[PDB]
Design a protein around this ligand. Structure first.
Ligand SMILES: *Cc1cc2c(cc1C)nc1c(=O)[nH]c(=O)nc-1n2C[C@H](O)[C@H](O)[C@H](O)COP(=O)(O)OP(=O)(O)OC[C@H]1O[C@@H](n2cnc3c(N)ncnc32)[C@H](O)[C@@H]1O
Ligand SMILES: *Cc1cc2c(cc1C)nc1c(=O)[nH]c(=O)nc-1n2C[C@H](O)[C@H](O)[C@H](O)COP(=O)(O)OP(=O)(O)OC[C@H]1O[C@@H](n2cnc3c(N)ncnc32)[C@H](O)[C@@H]1O
Lengths: 577, 577, 52, 104
């Protein structure tokens, strides 16, 4: 451990790694702290799905996801257990037990909301969907100049996509993918556009995809090293950062109080620049624990001295989910280019197609796969190859369907009573709505109850806003019901439903961005700088102040890229040793 | 990769690591291959539970375990779904799908049997219980000399206990542990003895336990290095070992055929010594694929040329399980030495005790912990501190009660209906029964159906033998019901029950040990050498030929230590170039 | 037949959480008395299985 | 085979059936409310010993059916309520409501 750094970054997720990539690359002496540990192999902070074993056993990765999701705020449990033995100790009240939060109203919670403490953060398990936001979903970066605002967002997004290795062609030779996409494109001819979900991922072989993560953005190895002899970077895993120390004038941060969890001791780490990228929830917790905003149950009688908007206007997306079982018409269409003679199993059985025929509905690569599977596996009653990659389909957010869609196969939600149905038939449907930012929707922190790291316990006061937010949610659910019927009927056990609030994990607005602290009711400017403070920055979905339906990560990364440009312009890297 | 090794080891579990520790340390040029990948941070092969985050959220590790347990044999699914939309594609038979094994009779299965494919094997997730087998459970290493056999076993066990870092003091200052231990000691005074479960672990702090793994036995770092400059070791992860090639005489192994999973290429590796430590299931797989034993469905009419007992006489333990809720009686006894003045919640409230008073029921350290908890958390109705370590109690296997017992809190099994009850009240009970080896209980490998790695699909033919095994299993269930009632009543949702066959994961006897291949129906001698073959060795629970109730890892490790003694005596290390 | 003529004597106020209702659905802000619940009843001091 | 074991409950003054002066049932009658706990001491002890006995005895016949493991049923599901208007010889000495002719 060193005493003094140019830059200090709290958190090693993909936003924190965006900062590290830019600032280490520009010659700053950078230290990064994570509360969690080096987990997923020799490539530090890499995607846990990138093992041969998980891509052969995709049903098992849900357990990895669940194993690093720790519930943010769990109400006191009032389930009645009255079949205990008379001999068993029983209390006479529903007292605070098992990590429950007695501050949490269970009817105004984001119970599905969860956090991940490992190096690489949630990017070790995420789905890698990186869509851009259109105008209606994104914050302005330039006032009163739509075209310059467009050009600035395009410039940032192009960079972010490049760090994440975002592409739209990894699933171009998937039958199931093109089957579903082609059908939906036809059904909505002249009404909606469909494409592949932009995925942060690179195909390595027809059966292996290298999914992107924090590691892709910055490899997290200590520097200087052999391949980067002029760079300076240190990663300190298992370090809980507890607070930023403000000066008396509230114009600058003086140090970072840390707690090393292996040794048990505490330090003051000094830097020119402090960056908080601990997640939407934990950024806010650190700030409140540092004197920003207001500790305890909110009350407008005693308004905070700093960042009054902190923890207000929080947004979380509505999520509807179901799964379908592919229609007979769609499965029959997979072999429509084939000439078939005789019965499967008989010596005379023959499956052919004409390569390159004008009248073929499917390309040569598709027909060749189908032909081979049908010939080589005559016991099998389906024309889809066993090793065909999953569908990855979207129709992106538009004013006449203001929701994101994912029509795909997620690693999350694997369950086995409906696993009587062939996996080749199954498609997941996830529709995400946007949520108007409202002052009453709050994330706040207990002044008495602490979490497992001895920090102020997060508490939600959240309800989906009446008006547009609620109307759009019901219209969305109907939209998914209508659209999915075009592909097939619902799979029993996975019927259309709203998921538990927060389970979507796309929380935004906890420390939101704007031009003016008072007028835009915000905490950071467009450089992601905390108002009033010269050297404190915040990165992450917590900056996003609008109502958004798409996955926010890429947008957060774009904002971080812009924040680093400001840093590079205003702070001088120290001389190399 | 590289050309020629002295020793080649298949599998990087704790048994494979025992052979590496002995052999690398003795000067041999060793290479190790594992089909799985580096998975537990910078310490290669380490316990995945050794992160601060898991020791604070013990409920979450159950997911990590489930996430790396791939079922060995899944029968064809015949569950009926008849509420599909008429529009969805439906097959008219229960055809082979989703990885099902059509060779598998669903009524003669080890449904719970599963395997882990990661560097470090199952020791990256295991419970770490490492008790010794007494005479009745263990194989003879010396004929007609029970005192010499005892001395040999004590010598090997002691060395194994040292590699695994086994001890029985890691939980000595837990009030829950001592609460339970003392109660059972009293209840069974002069009938049964109770102690801490022997655990491969080292306590680092009041809240952190370093659990042992493969890594504890051998660090798995490539040598030569700074700390071992004259040692030679190379680990090769993501390499599926496929076949050992037998020479013409069936007297020697000529090579090992491997499949590099990253590149896709296949190779022929040569060494002087070949060690298979791929687990009870995959050792057998590899051997059957190599021309040992018999490929395909068993038939007596054409008996195998080599190792006819391979895959017969397999044993797996019966496992019964429940949880209890601590009795009022026991909870109240925790504070029996306290004097209480005033009401909780007031500044006038006072909990005191008299250190060293002879009338005290509990030691001073116990009373200090209770007092401090009751004073600091006056809204809590329980006298047990929040951070109090779990109980780790056992009464070891004996002729009068021939089952192993664990009275403890396991990572495995964490639920969500019954998390209404304070976890300080809850104790797990697991009794493990022994199973007599029968020739008709079998593991065999399909001549037509293959697994995810294109190897012969494992299939079980197993039922619990009638007679002693069955009678003991039911007596054992009764024993757990009788004993557990001394501590508390059952927790609803966790009632006494038998677990799915093979879930306990203690399969043994698949390539069993004995003195004489014919007379003792076995595959290896007491040096774990395959009969007839000068340079092939098998390690792991598959060597154990006996009926045993206790956790087998320590015993298999003792066997590998013995096996390395024979290797050191019969093969010369190549000169350090 | 038995279940069809056992009416519960005293059912406590229901406190199960249902947070997957559509945003559009009427939602309670309290666990109010409903569906024949007896607000006098302490749920931990009940004969919940008792019926007439 | 079904196994049912019924344990006896010591009659306690604190264990009460009462009737609301505010809430009414579906027949507009004062709503029944229970204030009931299985008494500590012998009742509780006997109740666990009874569980053990069932577990011991039933094992001589067979193992438990999955889905029907040994459990305590919900209080009152047994439907053997007594003592709500109990009999004794003397109203004050025997804390009761009717004599041995069942007369109030
Ligand atoms: C879990 C998940 C997330 C997810 C997803 C699917 C799943 C199962 N699908 C996504 C998708 O398709 N597209 C997308 O854009 N996002 C998707 N997500 C969410 C996405 O992964 C997150 O939005 C993103 O990972 C957030 O990035 P960020 O870098 O801002 O934050 P993080 O990943 O949560 O990591 C924060 C790090 O901070 C460390 N930490 C926390 N507190 C402290 C303190 N106090 N001190 C030091 N370090 C701290 C955490 O350990 C974490 O590593
Ligand atoms: C999962 C588990 C296991 C366990 C336990 C609790 C859990 C949740 N509790 C135990 C306990 O308290 N006490 C005990 O003695 N054992 C307990 N266990 C079981 C224990 O973990 C195992 O008995 C032990 O790990 C087995 O050791 P072994 O080294 O013999 O085998 P392994 O751990 O399965 O490792 C095998 C490695 O070989 C690789 N492999 C498999 N096939 C191939 C091929 N074809 N080629 C190359 N490598 C191969 C696997 O990848 C694995 O790493």
């Amino acid at each position: 451990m060193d005493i003094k750094y140019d830059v200090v970054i709290v958190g090693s997720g993909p936003i924190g790694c965006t900062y590290a990539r830019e600032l280490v690359g520009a010659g700053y002496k950078v230290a990064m702290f994570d509360i969690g540990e080096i987990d997923s192999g020799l490539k530090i902070g890499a995607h846990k799905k990138n093992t041969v074993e998980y891509q052969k056993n995709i049903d098992k990765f849900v357990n990895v996801i669940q194993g690093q999701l720790m519930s943010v705020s769990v109400p006191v449990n009032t389930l009645v257990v009255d079949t205990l033995s008379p001999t068993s100790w029983q209390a006479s009240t529903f007292f605070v037990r098992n990590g429950s939060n007695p501050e949490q109203d269970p009817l105004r919670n984001l119970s599905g909301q969860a956090v991940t403490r490992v190096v690489g953060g949630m990017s070790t398990h995420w789905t890698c969907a990186t869509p851009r936001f259109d105008r209606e979903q994104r914050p302005l970066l330039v006032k009163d100049d739509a075209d310059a605002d467009d050009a600035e967002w395009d410039r940032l997004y192009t960079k972010a996509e490049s760090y994440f290795q975002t592409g739209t062609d990894q699933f171009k030779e998937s039958i199931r993918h093109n089957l579903v996409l082609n059908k939906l494109a036809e059904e909505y001819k002249g009404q909606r556009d469909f494409q592949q979900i932009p995925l942060a991922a690179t195909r390595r072989s027809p059966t292996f995809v290298e999914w992107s993560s924090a590691n892709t953005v910055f490899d997290l190895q200590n520097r200087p090293n052999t391949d980067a002899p002029e760079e300076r970077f240190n990663l300190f895993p298992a370090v809980a950062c507890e607070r930023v120390v403000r000066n008396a004038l509230n114009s600058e941060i003086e140090s970072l109080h840390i707690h090393d969890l292996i040794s048990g001791d505490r330090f003051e780490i000094k830097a020119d620049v402090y960056v908080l990228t601990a997640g939407a929830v934990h950024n806010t917790q650190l700030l409140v624990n540092s004197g920003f905003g207001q500790l305890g149950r909110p009350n407008p009688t005693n308004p905070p001295e700093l960042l009054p908007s902190l923890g207000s206007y929080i947004t979380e997306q509505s999520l509807v989910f179901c799964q379908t079982v592919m229609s007979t018409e769609l499965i029959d269409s997979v072999k429509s280019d084939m000439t078939i003679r005789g019965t499967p199993g008989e010596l005379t059985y023959s499956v052919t197609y004409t390569p390159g025929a004008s009248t073929n509905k499917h390309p040569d690569w598709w027909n060749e796969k189908v032909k081979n599977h049908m010939m080589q596996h005559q016991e099998d009653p389906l024309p889809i190859p066993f090793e065909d990659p999953e569908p990855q389909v979207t129709t992106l957010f538009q004013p006449s369907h203001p929701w994101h869609t994912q029509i795909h196969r997620d690693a999350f939600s694997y369950g086995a009573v409906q696993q009587s149905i062939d996996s080749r038939l199954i498609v997941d449907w996830r529709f995400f709505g946007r949520t108007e930012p409202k002052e009453e929707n709050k994330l706040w922190f207990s002044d008495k109850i602490t979490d497992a790291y001895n920090m102020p316990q997060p508490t939600f006061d959240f309800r989906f806003p009446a008006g547009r937010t609620s109307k759009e949610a019901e219209d969305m659910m109907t939209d998914m019901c209508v659209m999915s019927a075009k592909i097939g009927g619902f799979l029993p056990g996975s019927l259309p439903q709203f998921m538990e609030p927060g389970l979507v994990l796309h929380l935004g607005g906890t420390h939101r961005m704007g031009f003016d602290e008072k007028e835009d009711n915000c905490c950071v400017n467009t450089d992601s700088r905390v108002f009033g403070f010269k050297n404190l920055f915040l990165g992450g979905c917590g900056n996003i102040p609008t109502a958004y339906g798409a996955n926010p990560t890429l947008t957060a990364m774009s904002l971080a890229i812009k924040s680093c440009e400001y840093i590079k312009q205003n702070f001088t890297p120290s001389p190399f040793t």
